[PDB]
């Protein structure tokens, strides 16, 4: 500080409150709009229903077809795309089923060369996708 009086506490406290309000990471966590605009509503995981499979392109020089899934949420009801993580796992997902989605790892930001996604897919049809890929389990009919 530079206001250094012995009886200066409320001015320093008000200045610290205002300059802490002039922030981004604190302003994200202490405002209602930043959590209201979140698709999960502040939750870690969420369940949804698959309505259409959409294939998106990649970014600059690295170019490949990345395959995602458009999911409609249960608790909210907004169409949010979700990227199927591993190799050849789109054959497991069919339309009009149940899928468990989660974040992909940067607290709500697009990661990598996929434009405009945030969330990945962990579990489909109440069974783990990792056991479907590895071969420990199998999708029931």
């Amino acid at each position: 500080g530079k206001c250094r009086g012995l009886r200066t506490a409320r001015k320093l406290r008000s200045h610290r409150r205002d300059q802490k309000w002039h922030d981004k990471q604190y302003k994200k966590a202490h405002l209602g709009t930043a959590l209201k605009a979140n698709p999960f509503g502040g939750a870690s995981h969420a369940k949804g229903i698959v309505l259409e499979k959409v294939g998106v392109e990649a970014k600059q020089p690295n170019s490949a077809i990345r395959k995602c899934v458009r999911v409609q949420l249960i608790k909210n009801g907004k169409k949010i795309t979700a990227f199927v993580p591993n190799d050849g796992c789109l054959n497991f997902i069919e339309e009009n089923d149940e899928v468990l989605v989660a974040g992909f790892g940067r607290k709500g930001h697009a990661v990598g060369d996929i434009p405009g996604v945030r969330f990945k897919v962990v579990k489909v049809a109440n069974v783990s996708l990792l056991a479907l890929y590895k071969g420990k389990k199998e999708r029931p009919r």
Binding site: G55, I65, K67, D87, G88, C89, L90, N91
Partner: protein, 57 residues
Amino acid sequence: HGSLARVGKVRGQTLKVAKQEKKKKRTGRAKRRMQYNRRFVNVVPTFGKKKGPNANS
């Protein structure tokens, strides 16, 4: 080629090799002691950058 939209093609057309025999454990009392004495006493690295224990050359 079929299409560019096929998934798991490299997972699909790849080869298949079965597994092998079963190794021995004693909870790290010689598994890491072997690589420790190889790194510290047995294999002497020549003056340079580094030397690894998995040098298959």
